[PDB]
Ligand binder design. Sequence first.
Ligand SMILES: C(#C[P+](c1ccccc1)(c1ccccc1)c1ccccc1)c1ccccc1
Lengths: 218, 209
Amino acid sequence: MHHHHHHIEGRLLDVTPLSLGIETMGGVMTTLIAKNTTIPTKHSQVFSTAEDNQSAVTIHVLQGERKRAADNKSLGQFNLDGINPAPRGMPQIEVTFDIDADGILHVSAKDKNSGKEQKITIKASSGLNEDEIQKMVRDAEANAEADRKFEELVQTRNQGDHLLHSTRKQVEEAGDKLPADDKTAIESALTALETALKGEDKAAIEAKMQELAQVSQK
Amino acid sequence: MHHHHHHIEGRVLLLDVTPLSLGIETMGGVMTTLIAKNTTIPTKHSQVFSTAEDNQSAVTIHVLQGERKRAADNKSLGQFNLDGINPAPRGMPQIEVTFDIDADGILHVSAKDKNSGKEQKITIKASSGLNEDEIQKMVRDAEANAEADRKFEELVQTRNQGDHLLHSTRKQVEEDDKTAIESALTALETALKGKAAIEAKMQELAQVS
Ligand SMILES: C(#C[P+](c1ccccc1)(c1ccccc1)c1ccccc1)c1ccccc1
């Protein structure tokens, strides 16, 4: 009398062996469920569109926590289409990761307007063994440098690609008044920006961003 | 007859049919229809597929919807992977793919390996979805393309068979005198990248076998 309490720990219904999440722009993994999360676990988070007016969206499920989603694993994949046109970014899609007591995974994507949604339910039945996942963890903690660095690069290449397409917009879609010689300028600007962002170097791509930035004046 | 013949009809409550033929991508990026368009539901269809190479490890079940024969000419739906299957030559393992649909729109994709015992199953639903205008458009354009896609199917069928032949050849050689067979190979594959001249190529590699 009263309020006699103490602290808590994990429930034991087994923890996740490896982190789960989806793939975002730049081919990078964003973890929606951290490694060793005691289940049943439901995480809700809201992503959105990369490009203008795109009518669909893909959700690619991952495991094996590491950046560069192609270096992780693929649990499943699916689409959500029929969505209404909006400029790049900011429609509202809602991604939900659910795991019940049976460890069977449920991924869902919803739309604020629309309301056309999809979902997947993954029954496993095979999975993996401690050895393999330990190899994945080891390889992950060895590659942490190039991983985080790659994340940085993805952020950058995203900014530069977005700025570039926005420059193509603000050039062609913008008035055709066409100040003299603008052609060559923004042409090799945005083009060198292209063949820069195609390959991967941070310094080169941002430099090219500046090169296209100075000529974007008028 | 003689008791009651009085034959049957498709069972439908109201709206329940598959509007689009549901299928799975196979080689050469060609759609293999597991459940045809305009099929009453519930409906379940099972088939057996297999690997394109020895010890292929995992495999990608790719679920699509549309009437087009080509991969990209359709609208994808979902996909997943079945891994951890034993070493074995092409076509040797039996991989069972199952498309289920119940009274709802919800579909169950099963994939199993009879020999390995390994199984993986996923569950998604029906359409993504997409508006009826779209679907009607894809259908109209499908009827449009038609025989072109048919020739595409015959094509990928050949190219797949011939590729199987080339793999079987190089594998049978273990590189004699096969020099003639090797440059005839290189030529035949050079043609194999880009119609009936491919069948001719198969004939040519068969002759110098
Ligand atoms: C479908 C459907 P749908 C439907 C509703 C209720 C019961 C069975 C099927 C549907 C409707 C709304 C959202 C999602 C699916 C349907 C309804 C009317 C016409 C065509 C299809 C479908 C089924 C198989 C493959 C692709 C699509």
